[PDB]
Amino acid sequence: NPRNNLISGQRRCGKGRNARGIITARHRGGGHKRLYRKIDFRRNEKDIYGKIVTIEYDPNRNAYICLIHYGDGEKRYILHPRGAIIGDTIVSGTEVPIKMGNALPLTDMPLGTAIHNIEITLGRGGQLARAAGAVAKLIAKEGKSATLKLPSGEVRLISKNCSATVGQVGNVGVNQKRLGRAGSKRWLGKRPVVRGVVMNPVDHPHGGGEGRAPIGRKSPTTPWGYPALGRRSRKRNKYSDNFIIRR
Amino acid sequence: KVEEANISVQNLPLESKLQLKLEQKIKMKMAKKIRLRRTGLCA
Amino acid sequence: AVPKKRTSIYKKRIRKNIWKKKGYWAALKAFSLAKSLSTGNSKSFF
Amino acid sequence: AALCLTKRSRSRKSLARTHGFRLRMSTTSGRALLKRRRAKGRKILCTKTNPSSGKRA
RNA sequence: GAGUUGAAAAUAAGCAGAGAUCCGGAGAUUCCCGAAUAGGUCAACCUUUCGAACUUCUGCUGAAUCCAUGGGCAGGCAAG
RNA sequence: GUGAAACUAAGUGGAGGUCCGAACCGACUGAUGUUGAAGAAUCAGCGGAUGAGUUGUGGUUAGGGGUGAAAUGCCACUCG
RNA sequence: AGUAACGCAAACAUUGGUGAGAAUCCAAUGCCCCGAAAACCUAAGGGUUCCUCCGCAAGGUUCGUCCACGGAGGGUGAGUCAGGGCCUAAGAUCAGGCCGAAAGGCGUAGUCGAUGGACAACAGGUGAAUAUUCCUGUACUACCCCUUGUUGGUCCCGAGGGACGGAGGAGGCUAGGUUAGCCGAAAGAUGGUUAUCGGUUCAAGGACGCAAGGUGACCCUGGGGUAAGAAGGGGUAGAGAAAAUGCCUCGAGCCAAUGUUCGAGUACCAGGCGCUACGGCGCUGAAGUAACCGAUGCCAUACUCCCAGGAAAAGCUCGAACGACCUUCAACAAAAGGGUACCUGUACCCGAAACCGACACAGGUAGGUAGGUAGAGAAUACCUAGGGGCGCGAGACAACUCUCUCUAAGGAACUCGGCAAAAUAGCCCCGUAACUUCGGGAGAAGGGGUGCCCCCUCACAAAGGGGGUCGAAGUGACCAGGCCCGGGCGACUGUUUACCAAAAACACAGGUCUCCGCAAAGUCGUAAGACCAUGUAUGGGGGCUGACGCCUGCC
RNA sequence: CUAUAACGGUCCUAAGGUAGCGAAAUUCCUUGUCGGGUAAGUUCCGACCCGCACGAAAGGCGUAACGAUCUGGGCACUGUC
C-alpha cells in the first residue's frame, strides 16, 4: 500500500545532469520516476516505542527502509538494521537499551559496539555509515570526542555529544548481485561511460594515434588534465579532527 | 462499421472522457444508494 | 555531349528552312484533300 | 526520414515564445534588436501569433 | 476672401457674406499594444472588486531587551 | 526416494535487452537514377521489432561553447 | 533546337450534351484501380484555397468552355465539443535576499506554463457553402427566485482523497459481421431453376438493476447448518479529522460492464402511386426477430507476477485557537418547481495539387474508425462503403538502355568474389549430430503426406483411419527459411561518419588501479552559488582492460 | 658419425622475455619448406621454425552461442557463362 503521505513526491527533475543546463556530472539519465521517500535521520522522537510494520524497498537508496509507527499517530521510515524482523520495537532516547536499531547519544554507549548511522555534528540528520550494510565500530571515547572508526578502514575522532544508531544497516546481499543484462545499468539511470583512449585529442588528453595507442603522457590524466592516479586531493587545512587516514 | 461509430460521437479523448463521466456519475449514484441502505439496516 | 561552339546564321537558316519546308510539302496534300472534298462522289467525311 | 527540411508544422504558440515580441523585449539584447528593426524601418518586426485568431483576411 | 466636403470622377446630399473651404496662436478628445502601469500575456489579447513598483508626504507602528529602531500597514499626492 | 535434503518425469506458470513476422524505426547488397520524379529517391531483396525501443506536445544545454554508446560526428541543407 | 522532355508500367472507351472552338468540361452506360486505402474525421500548419455567378491576358509542363488562376458577391452561430475564466509537472520569471566593471548571474514565497488532473448533450431533421452550434424531442451543470425549518457564517487553517509502473494470460461481456426466420419485390428474353434481391435501425439520459471474479474462510461440492471478521458503519482511549489502541455492530455480502422499462404507442424505412424544365417532391408505408463467432472497445489503477519500485496541486469529503463575521447581509433536506446561462476556435485541405521539401515535387506528416471471402494476422489476393482512372496524345513498331517472362545440352566453366538470378519455403509426422557455459546447438541435417468425394470412429468442436476419383503438377495463384564443413576478429542484443566507410570501431555485464569522511573529491561559474547528493565508503569521481576458463613473468 | 648445442666465457644495463602462441589483421626476403584439399590453388586448413620487428589487463591463449562481418571448400539451383 504505497502513498504513506510520506512518499512526498516531487523530487528534483530527473537525475541532475545540470547546474545550469550543462552536464556538470557526466552520464546520468534514463530510468524511472524513482519517486522518493522522506526517511528519517534527525530521529529526535525521544522515549516513544515504535513498531516495525514493513521493510519497504527504497529505490532512492541502497538499503531496505523499514516503517515504524508510534504510540501517537506518527509514522516514519528509518533504515533497517540487519535482523530487524517484522513487528519489533525500537526507541530513540538517551539511556535506551543497547539493542539493534535504536538510537542514543554517542557518549552513553559501550565502546566497540556496531554503530551504523551517526552525526558529524548536531542538528544534521545522519551523515556517516549509512549505506546498505555499512558499520562503524567505536574505539575508545575521550574528553569531548570519540575515536570512531568509520567504514573505510579509517579512524576519526568525532564529537561525543552527537546522536548515532546501534546495529549495522541491513541488506548486505546487494553487494554481490550481478547485473548481467548489460542494460540493467541503464534501468538504474547510468549512461555508458565511454573510455578515453579513443576520444580525439580535442576531447581528452589521450589523443588518437593510428592503431590503438597507449597513453603516452607522463601520467594518466582526467579529461581535465590532472593526474588520475595517486594524486591526493585534500585541502591542506580544513579540520584535522580525524586521527588516521587508514587508506 | 465507421459511420455507425461516429454517430455516437466518442473517439480518442472523448471516448475516454465520456466513459470517465459515466463511471463517475454512476459512482455518485451508488454512493447515495448505499449511504441510504445503511439506514436501511441499522434503523 | 556539350556543343563546342554556336553555329553560324548561315547553317541555322539552312536547317530552319528545312523544317518549314518540311511543312511546305505537307500542305499540297491537304489542298488535294480540299479540292476533292468540294462536293463529289466519295466515301469519307460523313 | 524526412528530407533535410528544416521547418516542420510546429505550433505557432511555441514559435512565438522563442521569438515572440514579449520574449524579444525582456532580454537586454532583445530590446536592442527592436532598436535596429525600427531604425532600418521594417514593418513586421516579429513573427507572432495571437490568442484570439492570428489572421485578418 | 470666395466657393467648397483630402489623392483620382462621379456618386449623395450638405455648408457658406446672418464668413463656408483655407491659413495661424492657444485649447479639447486622443480606442488597443508599446516605459506600459489593475493582474496575467503568445504585443495591439483575456480576467478584472477599475486601480503599478521606486522616491516623497501623513497616519499603524514587527523581532528581540513594551526600549529606541528599520521592516509591514494603510490614505497620499505625481516626480525617475 | 534422506531425522534433512540433494534430483528424475508430469502438469500449471509465464520469464526472456528470446524466436519468425506486419505497423514502426533504420540502413546492408544490387539495379534504376546521376542537366534525377527526388540537393541521397524508386524498385527487388534486408536488420531490430517489449526494448540499451519509437513517437507526439511543451521545455534544457551554445560558438573556442553545447552534446556526443567516440565518427571530430551533429548543432536548422553551412562545421578541425 | 524546335532538340531532351511533358514527373511512374491504375486504363480508358463510347453515345449525347455546352460552346466559335472538345481526347482534356458536364451527364449517362461500360471497363478499370485503391480498399490497414488512392476512404471518412481530427491535432498542428496554411489562411480565403470553401460556395455561387462571370472570365479567360499570364499560371496548368498539351488543350480548355475548366480550375485551388483573375473579377464580384457570399460563408464558418456552442451553458455541454477544444481552450480561457479552475489546478499544477518539465521549464520560465522571481518581490524582497545574496553576488557582480555596466548589462546582469544564483535564489525563496509568489505568478505564468499543459502535452496532464476538475468539470455538463444525444438522436433525427435542414441546407450552395455551418452544424454534438440552427430546428424538433428528451437530457445534464452552475447561479438566482419561492416554502419550511436550524440561526449560525465564509476564509485562513489541520486532515482524507484526488494519486496515477510494466508485462501476462485468463474470465464475463457488448459493438461487428455472418446463418436463420419475417416482410417486400422479382422471369432478370441460352439448359434448368428463385436455391435468387432489399429491409430486418434507434443514442445520450432517468428508474430498477444482477449471474460472473474477490470470503479459497473448517471439507464433501460448490447450497442448510452454528460463532468473531469482508465492502459500508458506531464508537471509546492520548479532545474536530484522519494517524496509531482495543471492543463491538440481525454482518454477511459487497464490486462492474452487460440486463429491463421508459426515452422511441415514436420516428426510421425497402417497397407503392403522380409530378418533373428528366434532379426533385408529394401520399402511403409491411417486418422490425433469434442462433453462431468475435473483439487489438468495456468491468480494469479485476487479478497474478515481476524489479527497474511508477508527478504533482486544485477541485471534492470530514473538523480544532468551535478564528474576522453573526438568521440584515448565512447555509443546508427541500419543492429535483419557475427563469437565466461569459469570452475565443468552428469554413476548406488535413496517408494532402492547397502543410513541410523553392514547381499542381513517382518524398515526409501525431491520433481515431476498421467490413466480406481465403488466411494464424492490421500481410497477402480479389471485392462492399467511399473515392479515383494519375492532367500531353495518336501512330509505328529498327538498333539500343531500363522493368520483366522463358530458354534446348551442360550447371560457376563467368568472375576480384556464384555478386546478381534461379532454387527452397506453409501444417502435420518420423529423425536430428559434432560440440556446450550443459541454457543451447536445432526449424540442425534429412525424409514423408497433404486436392476433391464417401464412411466411423478418437474430443466424439478439430484432426486421424479406410476406400474412391481427377491432373503432368495437390499449402498447387498471392504469401512463404537455401543448407552444410572449416577458419580470423569481436563474447552476445545494441550504438556510430544526416548525403561515398555499419566494421574486428564504440559501448556494454565483469576486472583491477586510484582519489573522496560529508559544510568529499570532481565539474561549471571571477562571485554568490548550483550539480554532485535531498546521496553518505558495498556509496561518488577518474584511468586502462572488456563475458567465461587457466593465468597474468622479469626490471 | 658429421651436425644442431643440454653447458659454458666475455662488455652490458635496471634487467635481460617467463607461460602460451607463432611466417599469424604482425615474416620483409616470400608464390618460405612439408602435408591435406584441387586435374592444376601466389588464396585456404594443419604443422615446422632463422618471431626482418609476437607476448601477458596499449592483456596471452582457448572458447558454446550470435554476426545484413572478413575468409576457404561443399550439395541443390539456375542465362552468371
Numbering used by the authors:
A (entry chain E): 23 to 269
B (entry chain g): 79 to 121
C (entry chain b): 2 to 47
D (entry chain d): 91 to 147
Sentences from the paper on this structure:
Genes encoded by these organellar genomes are transcribed by their own transcriptional machineries and translated by the unique ribosomes present in these organelles. Unlike the mitoribosome, which mainly synthesizes hydrophobic membrane proteins2139, the chloro-ribosome synthesizes both soluble and membrane proteins1040. Compared to the E. coli 70S, two of the LSU proteins (bL25 and uL30) are absent and six new plastid-specific ribosomal proteins (PSRPs) are added: four in the SSU and two in the LSU3140.
Our model comprises of 28 E. coli orthologous proteins with many containing chloroplast-specific N- and C- terminal extensions, two PSRPs and 4.8S, 5S and 23S rRNAs. However, analysis of our map reveals that nucleotide insertions and deletions have altered local rRNA structure significantly at five different places. High-resolution map allowed us to identify the unaccounted densities as PSRP5 and PSRP6 and build de novo models for these two proteins. As expected from the basic nature of PSRP5, its density is surrounded by rRNA suggesting its close association with rRNA. However, our map suggests that PSRP6 is an integral part of the spinach chloro-ribosome LSU. Taken together, it can be postulated that the significant differences present in three (uL23c, uL24c and uL29c) out of the four proteins (uL22c, uL23c, uL24c and uL29c) present at the tunnel exit site might reflect a chloroplast-specific mode of recruitment of protein biogenesis factors on the chloro-ribosome.
